[PDB]
Every structure is written in structure tokens, then in C-alpha cells.
């Protein structure tokens, strides 16, 4: 495994897992982190997940200034990898 | 009571997305059950108004989005449901 992925996993647990436990979505069940939902919303890329983390959307807050760009890349890679291999 | 029905309406419009049925899917250790409010020192009008105003963790604040009067109505609704059982 990658050290970046393991680092992204830890950042995910601290910042994302309460709302996206197991790649789901507590608030909005139509916007999970499953690959099919990511693809249906054009979010199945590192750049699009980083943009989502940075700006947020709807009931998801933005993390600009609270998570470094480098850490955002790590968590984006963690999410996409889990999505591709199945949460 | 015009206050409790109004608080119910403000709750449906602002809190039900995360606290439907008095639960808390994001953080299941912090529901709106009276027992959880007691466990966190939140079983009071003053404490719930502060929570609404400032938020905490994954809960946003509502300052400027809900009037002070409506916040008191929401707090009374929550405590009434908590006491009766959601
Ligand atoms: C609750 C306060 C959340 C936090 C913390 C995190 N996410 Fe989120 N996310 C949340 C909601 C309510 C939504 C839907 C927003 C909308 O406007 O509909 C999302 C969405 C996403 C997505 C898009 C999913 C899709 O299109 O299927 C992604 C990729 C995503 N969220 C990622 C993500 C990350 C990496 C987080 C930790 C930094 C994170 N979210 C936190 C709710 C909340
Ligand atoms: C998700 C975007 C939320 C919305 C909208 C509302 N609440 Fe919330 N609430 C949420 C979380 C994640 C938490 C736990 C916060 C933490 O730091 O751990 C809470 C907590 C409360 C509490 C305390 C409950 C307890 O057992 O201690 C109360 C009294 C509360 N929330 C009330 C409340 C009201 C009245 C809302 C509508 C104005 C509201 N919340 C919206 C998540 C979210």
C-alpha cells in the first residue's frame, strides 16, 4: 500500500467519516462516495474531489484553510481508491 | 401554544435534515433524547439556544439565519419532544 493512502485514510477519519461513514452520506443519501454516485455527478477524479473538499456544497462545509492542499490530495486519493475497490 | 407549533415548524425547516426523529445520524452519541441532552449539559433553553447560535463540530451555527425569538421557540419544542419522547 501507499503511505499517501494511509495518510489520506487518517485524514478522512478525522474530517469526513462522521458524515460519510463507510463511503455513504448521512445527510443526503443520493450523494455517496460510491463510484457510481461519483461518476453520476462528475466527481470521479482527484481534482473534482479536491474542489469539493475546498469549497463544499449544500450541507457539506468547505475545508479551505482547515486542511492543507497536500492533505486534500491524500484524502482525494484515499476516497477514489476506496470507491474503485469498494467501500 | 403559538410558540411550540412555531418551533416545530422552524425545526422542520432547519434541523430535521440532521435530527429527524430526535436522532443524530452524523454523531449518534449526541441525539436530542432527554438522556443525551442531560449527558452533555444541554437540557436547558439557554444551552440549546447557544448550540443553535454557535454550532459545534459538524453542526453549523444559525446566527443571523434564525431569529433569537425563533431560537427560543425551537428550544422549547426540542425540550418538549425530549420530555414526551420523540
Ligand atoms: C457533513 C457536515 C459533511 C462533512 C464533514 C463532509 N461531507 Fe462530503 N458531503 C456532505 C453532503 C451533505 C454532500 C452532498 C452535498 C450536496 O450539495 O448535495 C456531500 C458530498 C460530497 C461529495 C460528492 C459526492 C457525490 O457526488 O456523490 C464528495 C466527493 C465528498 N462529499 C467528500 C467529502 C470529504 C473528502 C470530506 C472530508 C474532508 C467530506 N466530504 C466531509 C456532507 C459532509
Ligand atoms: C447537520 C448539518 C446539523 C444540523 C442542520 C443541525 N444539527 Fe444539531 N447537531 C449536529 C451534530 C453533528 C451535533 C453533535 C456536535 C458535536 O460537536 O459533537 C449536534 C448537536 C446538537 C445538540 C446537542 C445534542 C446533545 O446530545 O448534546 C442540539 C441540542 C442540537 N444539535 C440542536 C439542533 C437544532 C435545534 C437544529 C436546527 C436549528 C440543529 N441542531 C441542526 C448536526 C446538525
Author numbering:
A (entry chain A): -1 to 85
B (entry chain B): 0 to 85
Provide the publication's sentences verbatim.
Cyt c6 is a small, water-soluble protein (~12 kDa) that contains a heme group as its active center. As an essential electron carrier, Cyt c6 mediates between the cytochrome b6f complex and photosystem I (PSI), enabling electron transfer that is fundamental for sustaining photosynthesis by maintaining the continuous flow of electrons through the photosynthetic chain. The crystal structures of Cyt c6 from both species revealed a conserved fold, consisting of five α-helices, a bound heme group, and loop regions, which closely resembled previously characterized Cyt c6 proteins from other species. The heme was covalently linked to two cysteine residues via thioether bonds, and the central iron atom was axially coordinated by methionine and histidine residues, maintaining consistent coordination geometry in both oxidized and reduced states.
Three distinct crystal forms of Cyt c6 were obtained using the sitting drop vapor diffusion method, yielding characteristic red crystals indicative of heme incorporation. High-resolution X-ray diffraction data determined the three-dimensional structures of reduced Cyt c6-7942 (red-Cyt c6-7942) at 1.7 Å resolution, reduced Cyt c6-6803 (red-Cyt c6-6803) at 1.9 Å resolution, and oxidized Cyt c6-7942 (oxi-Cyt c6-7942) at 1.4 Å resolution (the crystallographic statistics shown in Table S2). The tetramers and dodecamers were essentially composed of repeating dimeric units. Structural comparison of the peripheral and central dimers within the Cyt c6-6803 dodecamer also revealed consistency, with RMSD values ranging from 1.330 to 2.149 Å. The dimer interface of Cyt c6-6803 showed significant differences compared to that of Cyt c6-7942, being less extensive and lacking contributions from residues near the methionine axial ligand. Key residues involved in the dimerization of Cyt c6-6803 included Ala16, Cys17, Ala24, Ile25 and Pro59. Additionally, the distance between the iron atoms of the two hemes in the Cyt c6-6803 dimer was 17.0 Å, compared to 15.4 Å in Cyt c6-7942. The Cyt c6-6803 dimer exhibited a larger Fe–Fe distance and weaker dimer interactions compared to other Cyt c6 dimers. Notably, when one monomer of Cyt c6-6803 was superimposed onto Cyt c6-7942, the other monomer exhibited a 20° rotation relative to Cyt c6-7942, indicating a significant difference in dimer assembly. Despite the increased spacing, the hemes remained properly aligned, suggesting a structural flexibility in the dimers.
